[PDB]
Chain A
């Protein structure tokens, strides 16, 4: 049956993508520190298959980790567009989620979701390294639920 075959191929490509998330080496402010602590030995994001790569062309996920300013907004959008697809965005911390504690500033974008689509929101100021990892594992479970090929088969 087709519905069986496409279901199993969809699991395969879903498994590969979530099992190999390569965030861009991208970080803006305070929360970049906790993101470093998630790569540090105690949490070791690499053991889940999560590997930072500097190039946007070789990245799957953008972790927006810090305050986004008006001056910085076009640059953030640009490297997002240069990511091949599928690409996911994780908002980390209050500044990136909604402007946080500079929400009423003239120079701050009130949430990165004005500039780019967001998949997961990680609250905190900063979120702990363990909280960010929880948000990563939630992105993986989100990728695990995709039905690209099942939707194609009924299209």
Chain B
């Protein structure tokens, strides 16, 4: 039952090679993105965001799930490079208008009932 059709990678070493390859492409593209879209962020900010998005999935261990995240990552890169996305779509990564939400118990207790 544990035998499952592979998407691309036959193990987690082949999958992590594609993760690094995708990180290089995103790392190289950030300077062009900030230029073409005329973003007010710094190239350092954009690269810190790319790095951050890559740490959210750092706990994964399924080669097939890793491949899908890489497939979705490359799809997002194409929309940015070809400028299918717009400035509003690039700046949605930075959540600039969402007000900070409390993380601790007391601040969360005063506002409402959410856990």
Which A residues contact B (CB, under 8 angstroms)?
74
Q: Is B88 an interface residue (CB 8 A)?
A: yes
Chain B residues closer than 8 Å to A74, beta-carbon distance: 86, 88-89
Contact residues, B69-99 vs A (CB, 8 A): 86, 88-89
Which B residues contact A (CB, under 8 angstroms)?
86, 88-89
**Main SS at interface, chain A:** helix
What are 3 A-to-B residue pairs whose CB atoms are below 8 Å? A74-B86, A74-B88, A74-B89
Task: Give CA–CA (A74, B86) in the complex, Å.
Answer: 8
Task: Give CA–CA (A74, B83) in the complex, Å.
Answer: 14
Chain A residues closer than 8 Å to B89, beta-carbon distance: 74
Task: Give CA–CA (A107, B86) in the complex, Å.
Answer: 17
Task: Give CA–CA (A74, B90) in the complex, Å.
Answer: 12
Task: Give CA–CA (A78, B88) in the complex, Å.
Answer: 11
Chain A residues closer than 8 Å to B86, beta-carbon distance: 74
Query: Closest B-chain residue to A73, C-beta based?
Result: B88
Task: Give CA–CA (A74, B88) in the complex, Å.
Answer: 7
Task: Give CA–CA (A25, B43) in the complex, Å.
Answer: 39
Task: Give CA–CA (A74, B37) in the complex, Å.
Answer: 14
Task: Give CA–CA (A113, B113) in the complex, Å.
Answer: 31
Task: Give CA–CA (A74, B84) in the complex, Å.
Answer: 12
